[PDB]
């Protein structure tokens, strides 16, 4: 709820801090796209791929979109401060990045977490994907449903 200083300082973005779903309206599942962001305005700086890339690997497997294209797409929609920071370098990408990808590639994901399944991404979409998440630690995303 409080305004994050790196976001308001981020010169890749413009305008006010607002929930993702206010800036990028879609039919998101409740309480998944409420996270604060700003409109991304500057073109891509071509950030290196994240070291903890398992979310990209998982979505890539399920969509047949390369991890590079997924990552460049994230740089079209999110400010850089929300893509490369202490959290993403130590914990990886999150379900908030999944929501952003789901808007950018028009899919809804079922995430099979340790606490059960949950929907991420707009419902006004045709494509459906399955993602597995384990809390660990470390947090790990994998493609498909929880087997074994």
Numbering used by the authors: 730 to 877
Share the article's original sentences:
In addition, the TYMV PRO/DUB structure displayed a surprisingly exposed and minimal catalytic site, with a Cys783-His869 catalytic dyad instead of the conserved OTU DUB Cys-His-Asp/Asn catalytic triad. The structures reported herein reveal that the loop harboring the 865-GPP-867 motif is a highly mobile flap on the otherwise rigid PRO/DUB framework a result that is confirmed by molecular dynamics simulations.
Given the two similar classes (mild or severe) of DUB activity impairment, whether in loop mutants or distant patch mutants, we also examined the structure of the TYMV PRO/DUB I847A point mutant (hereafter 'I847A'), crystals of which were actually obtained first, and from which we seeded the ΔC5 crystals. The seeding procedure led to the same crystal form, and the I847A crystal is essentially identical to the ΔC5 crystal. The only difference in packing between the ΔC5 and I847A crystals is a slight shift of molecule 'B' with respect to molecule 'A'. The two I847A molecules appear superimposable to their counterparts in the ΔC5 crystal, with root-mean-square deviation of 0.09 Å for the 143 Cα carbons present and ordered in both 'A' molecules, and 0.23 Å for 141 Cα carbons present and ordered in both 'B' molecules. The fact that the two mutants I847A and ΔC5 display identical conformations in the same crystal packing environments shows that the mutations themselves have altered neither the overall structure of the molecule, nor the conformation of loop 864–868. Additionally, the structure of the I847A mutant confirms that the mutation indeed reduces the hydrophobic surface of the distant patch (black patches in Fig 3). Such a strategy also proved successful in the case of TYMV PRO/DUB, as we show here that mutants of the distant patch centered on I847 are indeed selectively defective in DUB activity.
